[PDB]
Ligand binder design. Structure first.
Ligand SMILES: CC(C)c1ccccc1O
Ligand SMILES: CC(C)c1ccccc1O
Lengths: 168, 168, 168, 168
């Protein structure tokens, strides 16, 4: 690329992999959202929580793709693997799966940051710090807070209803 | 001091001690606030309740220091002892500790008022009555009300969640 | 902690130490502020300057404590040592002591940043850069500017009055 | 009086004496104000400072007289002695004389409060605390602050001009 400068092939590939991870996460959240919209699950606050996260993860992927082009790298897309479950159990189960997912995304961000540091790519490092790393820490703290409240509420049906009504 | 009039060395020293007590109380409330912000505690209403009290106690100390200077006394600061606990247990435990703390502050105010009366210092007496004594009585009544509601709510997890959601 | 990820015990402890340093600095500024409010000192602009700094340092400590919880670390508080002086001398003396204090806080921030870099903790590194490092550089530049103006003004009483009236 | 209740002849007389003291103080401040308005003195800020105090002391006297009537006592007026000086010297001299005057008024208030306490007259005690004692403490602190600034400014002519321009 005529514009490419200080942008390694290793980072370019890792960015494409991270796009795939963010799109997969968006897909997982889409599935979580619609599961909580089932008439036999019917927790609207939980559905809304996960639909908003599907939106956030898609936006993350789009920001990465914008950055790939800004740097002169080439976006390459792969299949998006279907989510790991078809049914997501209770709100507690779902929130546990969400924190597992976010910790994996965070680890991928940290790995990419390490790669950028190793490659002396400060634009990449700053981009991640500015748009992704703090967003992830805040979201994981919020999920942990939710998990703690859900756990203290387990008369499990009553507790699940109250959390959806009064927290979400 | 060129302005000092009817202001005993005994009152001046007791005011400095009371500043220290109010700052210690602010510090204790700071610790309480952040404990309830822990991801494994996660009671935001409780965190907010104690953070607002940390602010109130600091403001109290500052008012005392302003008064010390208005009277021509000299502020003298001492170390602030760390709070008595590192972890504060349940909301019930915390509210019990808060009422113990406020009763101690109130007793110190009453002791200082008695000293002012003994020293025939009506400005001091009025200052305490106007800015501190009623504030303390109101706060202790509110804490007692909270303690009673928390106690009636002990399915203890459920009760702790509902109090934070519906009262705080 | 269920949320803790890439957050070393070394950083967690250093953050707690830095909270203590920021709270100690707030306390020092509280003492400076009230000294300049003494009827026999009576430099209101100087009092206001240091009271605003006491507020800034407390806010810094609170931001650190918020971050400690976001990362899944545990806040631990220690005694707050009383300020190093009971009386602070002239505005020049006070401003010299303030720059010494800020340079110490800045060094602690730089030490913690180095630790974060060594531990490959980019969230910590970014947090400090974003909220603390530039704030410190700006404040130290402002103090240095003030020190230079105070020094050029030493008829020392006249100079002290004019600085408080026309700069602060 | 048909309305008089718990109001001793001793307090009634002391209130009349205190009215006289407040009116005398107003007169003294009137003289101070106009001295600083002399073409060969010409310190407008100082003139304004003392004219506002003449107003405050007259208002104090009127509040006392209103209270005397509310309690069923009988106002009795005496001659108002002319102020102690015809010419008031420098701003420093004047501010020294003003603090002497206010300390005397404050002592009279404290004496009357003691008398009210001895006579078990809480309405009197509260009236003084609410309308006079804190006003006096604040005014004496302000005068002490002014005296300190005037003293640090003594090139005495230059210092007198700057204080009037930049403080008053
Ligand atoms: C003394 C001030 C700075 C303080 C210390 C600790 C906790 C809260 C405070 O306001
Ligand atoms: C007593 C009133 C009329 C009075 C006299 C002298 C100076 C000021 C005053 O308000």
């Amino acid at each position: 690329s005529q514009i490419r400068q200080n942008y390694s092939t290793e980072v370019e590939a890792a960015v494409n992999r991270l796009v795939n991870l963010y799109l997969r996460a968006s897909y997982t959240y889409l599935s979580l959202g619609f599961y909580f919209d089932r008439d036999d699950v019917a927790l609207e606050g939980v559905c809304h929580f996960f639909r908003e996260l599907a939106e956030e993860k898609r936006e993350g992927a789009e920001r990465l793709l914008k950055m790939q082009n800004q740097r002169g790298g080439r976006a390459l897309f792969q299949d998006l693997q279907k989510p790991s479950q078809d049914e997501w159990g209770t709100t507690l189960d779902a929130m546990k799966a969400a924190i597992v997912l976010e910790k994996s995304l965070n680890q991928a961000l940290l790995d990419l940051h390490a790669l950028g540091s190793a490659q002396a790519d400060p634009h990449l490092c700053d981009f991640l710090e500015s748009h992704f790393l703090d967003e992830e820490v805040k979201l994981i703290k919020k999920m942990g807070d939710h998990l703690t409240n859900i756990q203290r509420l387990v008369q499990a049906g009553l507790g699940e209803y109250l959390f959806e009504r009064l927290t979400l």
